[PDB]
Amino acid sequence: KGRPWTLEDILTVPEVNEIALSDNGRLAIYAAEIADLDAGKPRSHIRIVDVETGRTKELLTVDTIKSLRSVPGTQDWSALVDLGEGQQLYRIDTEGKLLPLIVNPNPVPVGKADMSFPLGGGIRPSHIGILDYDWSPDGKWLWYSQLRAKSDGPRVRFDEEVTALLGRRRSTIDVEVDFFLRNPEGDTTRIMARPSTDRVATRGGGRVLWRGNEVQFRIETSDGGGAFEFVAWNRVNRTVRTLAKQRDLLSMSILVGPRGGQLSTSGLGSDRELIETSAEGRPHSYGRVAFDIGDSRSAGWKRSRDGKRVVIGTRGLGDARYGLALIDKTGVRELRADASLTRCGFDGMLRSAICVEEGMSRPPRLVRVDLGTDKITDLGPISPRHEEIEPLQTIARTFVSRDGYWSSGYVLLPRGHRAADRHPAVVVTHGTDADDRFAEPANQWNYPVQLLAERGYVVLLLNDPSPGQSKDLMDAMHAWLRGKGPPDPETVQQKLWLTGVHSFEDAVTELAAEGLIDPARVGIAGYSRGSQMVNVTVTNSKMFRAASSGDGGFLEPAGYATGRSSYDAVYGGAPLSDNIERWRRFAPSLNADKVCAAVLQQVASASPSQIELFEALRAAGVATQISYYPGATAASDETHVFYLTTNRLRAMRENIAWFDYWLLDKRDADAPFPDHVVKWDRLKKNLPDRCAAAP
Amino acid sequence: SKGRPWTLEDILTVPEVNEIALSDNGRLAIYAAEIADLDAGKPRSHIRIVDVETGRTKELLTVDTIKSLRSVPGTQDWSALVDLGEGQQLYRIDTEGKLLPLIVNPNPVPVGKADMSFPLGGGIRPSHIGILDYDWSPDGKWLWYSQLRAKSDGPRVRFDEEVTALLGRRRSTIDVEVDFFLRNPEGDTTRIMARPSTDRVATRGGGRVLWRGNEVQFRIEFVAWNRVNRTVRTLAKSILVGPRGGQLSTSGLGSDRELIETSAEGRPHSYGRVAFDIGDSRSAGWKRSRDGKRVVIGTRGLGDARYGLALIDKTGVRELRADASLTRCGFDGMLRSAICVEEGMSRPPRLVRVDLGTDKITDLGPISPRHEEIEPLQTIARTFVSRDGYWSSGYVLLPRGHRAADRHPAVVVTHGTDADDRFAEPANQWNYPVQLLAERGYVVLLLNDPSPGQSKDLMDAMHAWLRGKGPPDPETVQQKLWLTGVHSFEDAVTELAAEGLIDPARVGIAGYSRGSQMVNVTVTNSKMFRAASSGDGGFLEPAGYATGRSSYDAVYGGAPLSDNIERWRRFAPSLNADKVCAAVLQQVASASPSQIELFEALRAAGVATQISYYPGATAASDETHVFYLTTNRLRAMRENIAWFDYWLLDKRDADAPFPDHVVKWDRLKKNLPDRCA
Ligand SMILES: OC[C@H]1O[C@@H](O)[C@H](O)[C@@H](O)[C@@H]1O
Ligand SMILES: OC[C@H]1O[C@@H](O)[C@H](O)[C@@H](O)[C@@H]1O
Numbered sequence A: 001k002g003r004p005w006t007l008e009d010i011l012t013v014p015e016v017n018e019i020a021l022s023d024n025g026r027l028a029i030y031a032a033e034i035a036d037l038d039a040g041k042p043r044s045h046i047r048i049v050d051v052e053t054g055r056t057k058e059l060l061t062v063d064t065i066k067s068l069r070s071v072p073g074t075q076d077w078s079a080l081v082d083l084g085e086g087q088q089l090y091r092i093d094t095e096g097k098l099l100p101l102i103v104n105p106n107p108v109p110v111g112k113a114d115m116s117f118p119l120g121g122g123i124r125p126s127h128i129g130i131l132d133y134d135w136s137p138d139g140k141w142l143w144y145s146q147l148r149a150k151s152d153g154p155r156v157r158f159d160e161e162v163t164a165l166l167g168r169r170r171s172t173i174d175v176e177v178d179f180f181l182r183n184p185e186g187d188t189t190r191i192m193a194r195p196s197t198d199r200v201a202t203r204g205g206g207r208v209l210w211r212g213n214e215v216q217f218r219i220e221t222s223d224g225g226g227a228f229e230f231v232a233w234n235r236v237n238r239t240v241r242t243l244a245k246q247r248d249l250l251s252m253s254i255l256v257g258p259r260g261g262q263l264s265t266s267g268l269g270s271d272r273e274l275i276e277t278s279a280e281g282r283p284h285s286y287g288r289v290a291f292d293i294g295d296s297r298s299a300g301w302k303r304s305r306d307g308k309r310v311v312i313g314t315r316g317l318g319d320a321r322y323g324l325a326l327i328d329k330t331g332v333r334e335l336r337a338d339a340s341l342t343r344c345g346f347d348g349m350l351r352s353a354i355c356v357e358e359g360m361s362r363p364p365r366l367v368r369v370d371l372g373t374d375k376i377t378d379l380g381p382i383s384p385r386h387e388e389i390e391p392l393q394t395i396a397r398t399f400v401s402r403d404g405y406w407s408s409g410y411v412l413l414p415r416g417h418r419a420a421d422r423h424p425a426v427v428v429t430h431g432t433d434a435d436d437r438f439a440e441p442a443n444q445w446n447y448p449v450q451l452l453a454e455r456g457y458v459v460l461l462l463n464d465p466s467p468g469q470s471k472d473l474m475d476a477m478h479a480w481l482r483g484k485g486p487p488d489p490e491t492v493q494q495k496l497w498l499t500g501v502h503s504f505e506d507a508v509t510e511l512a513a514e515g516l517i518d519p520a521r522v523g524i525a526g527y528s529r530g531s532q533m534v535n536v537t538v539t540n541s542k543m544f545r546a547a548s549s550g551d552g553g554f555l556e557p558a559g560y561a562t563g564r565s566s567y568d569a570v571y572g573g574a575p576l577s578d579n580i581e582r583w584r585r586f587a588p589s590l591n592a593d594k595v596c597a598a599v600l601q602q603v604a605s606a607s608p609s610q611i612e613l614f615e616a617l618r619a620a621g622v623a624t625q626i627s628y629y630p631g632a633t634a635a636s637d638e639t640h641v642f643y644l645t646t647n648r649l650r651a652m653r654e655n656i657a658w659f660d661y662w663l664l665d666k667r668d669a670d671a672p673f674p675d676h677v678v679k680w681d682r683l684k685k686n687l688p689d690r691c692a693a694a695p
Numbered sequence B: 001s002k003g004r005p006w007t008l009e010d011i012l013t014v015p016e017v018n019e020i021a022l023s024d025n026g027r028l029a030i031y032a033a034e035i036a037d038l039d040a041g042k043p044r045s046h047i048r049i050v051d052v053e054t055g056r057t058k059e060l061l062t063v064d065t066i067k068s069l070r071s072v073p074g075t076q077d078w079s080a081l082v083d084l085g086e087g088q089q090l091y092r093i094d095t096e097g098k099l100l101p102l103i104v105n106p107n108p109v110p111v112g113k114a115d116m117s118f119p120l121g122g123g124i125r126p127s128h129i130g131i132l133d134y135d136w137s138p139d140g141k142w143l144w145y146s147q148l149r150a151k152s153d154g155p156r157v158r159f160d161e162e163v164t165a166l167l168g169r170r171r172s173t174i175d176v177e178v179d180f181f182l183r184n185p186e187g188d189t190t191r192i193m194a195r196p197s198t199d200r201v202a203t204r205g206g207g208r209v210l211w212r213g214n215e216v217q218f219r220i221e222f223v224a225w226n227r228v229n230r231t232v233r234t235l236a237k238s239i240l241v242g243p244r245g246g247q248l249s250t251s252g253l254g255s256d257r258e259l260i261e262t263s264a265e266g267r268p269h270s271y272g273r274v275a276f277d278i279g280d281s282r283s284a285g286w287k288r289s290r291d292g293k294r295v296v297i298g299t300r301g302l303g304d305a306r307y308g309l310a311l312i313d314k315t316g317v318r319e320l321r322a323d324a325s326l327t328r329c330g331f332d333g334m335l336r337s338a339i340c341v342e343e344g345m346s347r348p349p350r351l352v353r354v355d356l357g358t359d360k361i362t363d364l365g366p367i368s369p370r371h372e373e374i375e376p377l378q379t380i381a382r383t384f385v386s387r388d389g390y391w392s393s394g395y396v397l398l399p400r401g402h403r404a405a406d407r408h409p410a411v412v413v414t415h416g417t418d419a420d421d422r423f424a425e426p427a428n429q430w431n432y433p434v435q436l437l438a439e440r441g442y443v444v445l446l447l448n449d450p451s452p453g454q455s456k457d458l459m460d461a462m463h464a465w466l467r468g469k470g471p472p473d474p475e476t477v478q479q480k481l482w483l484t485g486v487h488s489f490e491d492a493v494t495e496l497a498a499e500g501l502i503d504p505a506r507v508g509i510a511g512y513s514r515g516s517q518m519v520n521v522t523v524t525n526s527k528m529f530r531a532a533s534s535g536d537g538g539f540l541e542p543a544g545y546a547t548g549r550s551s552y553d554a555v556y557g558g559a560p561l562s563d564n565i566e567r568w569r570r571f572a573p574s575l576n577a578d579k580v581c582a583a584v585l586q587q588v589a590s591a592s593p594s595q596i597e598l599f600e601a602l603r604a605a606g607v608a609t610q611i612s613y614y615p616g617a618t619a620a621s622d623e624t625h626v627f628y629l630t631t632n633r634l635r636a637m638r639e640n641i642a643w644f645d646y647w648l649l650d651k652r653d654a655d656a657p658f659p660d661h662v663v664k665w666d667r668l669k670k671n672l673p674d675r676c677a
Helices: A007-011 A159-163 A199-203 A449-454 A471-482 A489-513 A529-540 A557-571 A580-586 A608-619 A645-662 A676-685 B008-012 B160-166 B369-373 B434-439 B456-467 B474-498 B514-525 B542-556 B565-571 B593-604 B630-647 B660-670
Strands: A015-021 A027-035 A042-050 A056-062 A064-070 A077-082 A087-092 A098-102 A108-110 A126-128 A132-135 A142-149 A175-182 A188-194 A208-211 A214-219 A228-234 A240-245 A262-266 A272-277 A283-289 A291-293 A301-303 A310-316 A322-327 A332-334 A340-346 A352-358 A365-370 A375-381 A393-396 A409-413 A423-428 A458-462 A517-527 A546-550 A598-603 A623-628 B016-022 B028-036 B043-051 B057-063 B065-071 B078-083 B088-093 B099-101 B109-111 B127-129 B131-136 B143-150 B176-183 B189-196 B209-212 B215-218 B223-226 B231-233 B247-251 B257-262 B270-274 B286-288 B294-301 B307-313 B317-319 B325-331 B337-343 B350-355 B360-366 B379-385 B391-397 B408-413 B443-447 B502-512 B531-535 B583-588 B609-613
Touching: A007 A449, A007 A645, A015 A064, A015 A340, A015 A352, A027 A064, A027 A340, A042 A064, A064 A132, A077 A098, A077 A132, A087 A126, A108 A142, A159 B593, A159 B609, A175 A199, A188 A228, A199 A214, A262 A291, A272 A291, A283 A332, A310 A340, A322 A340, A322 A352, A340 A365, A352 A375, A409 A449, A423 A449, A423 A489, A449 A458, A449 A645, A458 A489, A471 A489, A471 A557, A489 A517, A489 A529, A489 A557, A489 A580, A517 A529, A517 A645, A529 A546, A529 A598, A546 A645, A557 A580, A557 A608, A557 B593, A598 A608, A598 A645, A608 A623, A608 B160, A608 B542, A623 A645, A623 A676, A623 B160, A645 A676, B008 B434, B008 B630, B016 B337, B028 B065, B028 B325, B028 B337, B043 B065, B065 B131, B078 B131, B088 B127, B088 B131, B109 B143, B189 B223, B270 B317, B294 B325, B307 B325, B325 B350, B337 B360, B360 B369, B379 B474, B391 B434, B391 B474, B408 B434, B408 B474, B434 B443, B434 B630, B443 B474, B456 B474, B456 B542, B474 B502, B474 B514, B474 B542, B474 B565, B502 B514, B502 B630, B514 B531, B531 B630, B542 B565, B542 B593, B583 B593, B583 B630, B593 B609, B609 B630, B609 B660, B630 B660
Parallel strands: A423 A458, A423 A517, A517 A546, A546 A598, A598 A623, B016 B065, B016 B325, B408 B443, B408 B502, B502 B531, B531 B583, B583 B609
Antiparallel strands: A015 A027, A027 A042, A042 A056, A064 A077, A077 A087, A087 A098, A108 A126, A132 A142, A142 A175, A175 A188, A208 A214, A214 A228, A228 A240, A262 A272, A272 A283, A291 A310, A301 A310, A310 A322, A322 A332, A340 A352, A352 A365, A365 A375, A393 A409, A409 A458, B016 B028, B028 B043, B043 B057, B065 B078, B078 B088, B088 B099, B109 B127, B131 B143, B143 B176, B176 B189, B209 B215, B215 B223, B223 B231, B247 B257, B257 B270, B286 B294, B294 B307, B307 B317, B325 B337, B337 B350, B350 B360, B379 B391, B391 B443
């Protein structure tokens, strides 16, 4: 029959971002990131699979594993793993054991921590011995880069160097990036050194071109006005070159097709056009396609060795299901599957492939795909403990709003649900991330969607209106990234934000007409992008009784000086400029007078924008609470997506108690912070008369 | 021998003495001089013992920091809070000068501005504190000391009022508790209380504690503790106390005042018409004899701007005649003899002993012989009255080799009223080498804000700024506290320029903190100054409202986004950036959002501006509001010289600490908007 959803099952759901296949397709290897209670943070369980037999063997558990590839010229594998001493390049033999490949004796601190380097924009605090690596096609040469802490005295900084320190919450160290090359004889020389201002050099995972006597990779300099800059290292003369191009290089570009040109999906509406644009600019169309292209949530892209076949990850329109598409000179062909294929890996000749089969109602599984016959065979499950959970009832629905734009998403029915039953509702929204995938933390975050359903809630997971359905939305997006118009700021607020409030309202009213939702008790929750939507809805809508905004702060005037270009499209200028009235009408901090609801903030960054929303809401009589979740120690911080099991479990349980209280008038003694329920009773009695219910 | 000119290292190494003590027998005295060490990069205190009759001094040793230097009541020894580099502990000084420890905390907690420390305040460099405060029982047996204990609880999720307090955090911190201990004469220490960090008098608080019978009574944020019963008690419902047991006050205003001792229930008593103001924190302070019949207070004259001593008793008030200012003074218990530090604007620090009976001053010799070598600079005490009738006092510093009819450029240095008779006070001239500029040909005018005690208009505005709300009007608070000082600066410059002293074409203004506000407001509301520098500023800017709300609400009436938005736009210097045709340099240790905003606003307006951010000894520690690092304040003096010489004098040098700037300044000068020419 199955068992219900425990909160720990939401915490222990695995994530597979790394999967690789042998050049002969006989064996494969992957890693499942699982939250560990004893360690308090996620660990990656490395497993080896025999694709022919289907049997799997577990090898080890590391802290992190990244850039998992098969070593050319051998049957072995290479990866960047951290055993707890810092991330180094390791080799994994065909028998499933790992040994060091290149070890940096002095890894540098990275992430949000005291005296670390802000590398990946607030990733986990750790040490990086080896940053990035790539094999030559023959496997003889090895290219790798590693971070080197900058040993130097504290120096007087100046004009632009001070303003970059505006938002510093902790101590930082400066570094440089060293690039090395390893000949077949085992001797390594340093190619060049790049500063910290080079953002492609510090990011890693970049492209590198092995051609002729040269090895080529891309770099960024302070100037690029704008341009594309590359450096080529001659393996013979041992010299360097500098390339500057107006248009980016296709050889170093992702998503290239059999013709050799860039792939894109243009147009809007019911479907898109898949075109291949040559470097000279003449397009080649493969016809009409039902999917989008090139999403990091898809299987990525790979091209064969002859260049006549490519495989691209596809997210279809309206089914929000990830899949594969095959492209040769004849044309595009999709391949059907009952579920979505998110993370994949491919052989050398691009014939056999292995993928992670994922679904909204089904847990991740491993599958082998024969790309010639479009035949997939089921391998063993990934997480068996989620396979024993009885599947919740999940319905995929698209809603149309009063402004004509459609919003996709899913509907979670409570356990034991009977037809024609009214239930309270919780709306969880982050970006486009409601799709066919299993309990993706990038969507539901700390909101226990599956647990809310077990307790009788109807959870509505609803995406933002897809900007690709209309040029009105997409033109506002293009103005958002450009930092200028057209269109004007008043329209940017309508299409990017305010129309989502209508899509949320009109989705609840429609389901209320079905008899599935009690409009009296309903709530909205989201983080990041969803935080903006939550904060804009509760200001511009009276429909929602309670709300939870995870780690927000965009659209508030406090964070302007950091994000000017992102704010200028929305508000048309600075808060104290002549655009001040544009800030008063929209920004939620100044509009708190319009807020009647329970607004809870779960905040890891303690930013001045998150604080300004709380003080403005609290000073207006609104019932509100802010929760600052800390790092593993006072020296570190918490990431955007919480990596600490203790902060995840409580935030989940804090949302359970927050919505059970305001929506359902339900109080629990085993709640994570007991003395709060009396504080919320005081927040209820002190509510303003403005918030009185309709007569 | 006339002497030798000044040097940056002379200004840097000027000693300052905050600790001086005298034995109850008056025969021996001990003090400590804080001097900047080039080798260590930070200042170090030199403990010195003095023979009060002869003036003989010998060097005991050199320590990092020494505080709370006093004499033990029971014997001829001494006790002080000393940090040898292992953290600040409680040390006893032998009668022969040797140092032996008394209370030593094996677990000193880190404090200061730095990573994973505790942010005390006042001002502090990153350091470890084993023992915080101490006091002796009046008989010298029982010992009461305060130490700082780090709270070991793990990281906790914070909540509403806790999170908004983390708004302005630039680093990691720890939370601590204070433990109060009591040491019996038999050598056993027992713990009394434990108090949270929220208590200020227990964290940065002073030395106020009272012994009554068997009870030790100290203040918390009043409580009594019995040494016998071992029981705490919150007692039922002092400082600057005269001989009659009441509060001492100075009432009235103008150029003359009247001493008042208010009776316990408020019956006033006048000691007569008096020529000074009450003792500031920079004066000799206040001390009362255990007899209760003699009280000595530090004084500050009005016309003299000099520090001194006033001795009051049942007879009356006596004003001690001194040719220079007496800043820090050690005393005996009965207030009979005193050893003081004598200094002036042109007068290097000296040691003098004072007999309070006969009011005779006796020179015990200089302090630093290095500054005795320097030939003095001409310093004229001058008072400028503005167009509004308010007067401001200061010193006119003439350049080396100044003759009649000669005119020179000018630089105005202002902090609060810190311009008085004192020798190279770092709290006034800060990082501006006021003495070097005179050697280089400048005419430096050190001018204070208009003396607030001269009018009821100013004192009401200062009261409203401190209270946090009106009356008076926000527009009057802007005019009385700030804009009327710009008029005082303007009228003072015109007074000297008409007299044939300074050239109006080349003149500049410099200041830090309170002087930065007066620099930022002056360059916006006045065109008379070509160049400017503002140290460690950022007040009056909109970025700091969410922290300093209480301070801003009186000036602007409310938040910048409220209906008072128009009040900010007329005044706040970052919003006026297009009114500034001068060159604005910012020397900044805090890298605060209010200082960056003023820079980005001035740069967006085409104004020539630069912000120099000076770091700490490590990336894990910051630099204090007053620079304690030798390298930082050494080239900061060089930067101001290079800044004013380029803009005012159009002079270049390779001695500039940053050679890349002189070219960058050419680009900034060339891109100046058409408004300025
Ligand atoms: O880069 C493409 C990757 O495809 C994967 O399927 C292979 O296992 C890797 O060896 C290869 O690097
Ligand atoms: O002002 C009183 C003066 O008395 C003289 O006897 C001393 O030599 C001076 O040092 C002192 O300043």
